[PDB]
Amino acid sequence: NEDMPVERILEAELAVEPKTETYVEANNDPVTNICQAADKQLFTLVEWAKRIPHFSELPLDDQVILLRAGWNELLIASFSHRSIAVKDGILLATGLHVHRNSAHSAGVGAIFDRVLTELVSKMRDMQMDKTELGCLRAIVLFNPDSKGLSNPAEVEALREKVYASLEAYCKHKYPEQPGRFAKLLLRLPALRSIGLKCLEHLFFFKLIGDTPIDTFLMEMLEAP
Template sequence: QEERQRNKEREGEVESSSAVNEEMPVEKILEAEMAVEQKTELHADGSSGGSSPNDPVTNICQAADKQLFTLVEWAKRIPHFSELALDDQVILLRAGWNELLIASFSHRSISVKDGILLATGLHVHRNSAHSAGVGAIFDRAHNAEV
């Protein structure tokens, strides 16, 4: 009898996780990611024509600004997000923007050694981050990546 009860509990777990997949299909999340990534590549190609300042802090701030804009575009494409009240959307984005940014450039930087690749296509090396005064932030983010 205990065995049957455990099997019922396991079957219920499978049912609940498959219901989540129906409400939040991985394909839709991937679709949102690809659409935003494609937009990011188009903007990076069009705006990286030598007019970028050499100041690392300015470059990092511009990349963060661009990534935050992209994050909002991505969230709008996630199933059910747009159905939330605008206040709730803002609360969610404010609560999770930093983790989402770190996840984004960490994913983008998987193949980069001792550096991160920002949304603008800018590669920030560890030494540059330290000389710009953002070394502690860089190290925390880079450690989260590993």
């Protein structure tokens, strides 16, 4: 993990983690609050990316492409892992706790359930730790398939560096679990599918014009 230290990736994760006081300070439209949280987190996502080894060394236009291509999955991965701390629902970065009943009444119960079943429950069952989550997110970030990349080979090289470090980390931290590395990578297709379905919901909310959408989220939703 010399060129891609897991210690640095963990550091990046901890650096943008919502504070305990934010949750304490609190405990009405569910979708509006969720979208507000997403906008807030888009700013911290940029901060997080800059802390991932070598991301800032990529040409600016490629940094832009990678973040536009992966913000949806990157944010879902983040709040999903954050939510293993509660028995049900999801904890928003704004401190609010959204329960299943609220999601269903709001009309987004199916995708909310997919997140809880395919991501949250699986992360909690295997006790995915923050270092592992951080590496999976970095892998998602370094997506060499993103169209428009000036140097996709370098992004591909960076991704390979991350999964090499992640495998070494898993082998050392959990020697008793040989298939843990594969198990982690195999949550990525589910994350991809869920991210695509979430985007479909966001475009609908935007199209209706009923939901307040802040500046950064709006920019991410508007074509290049």
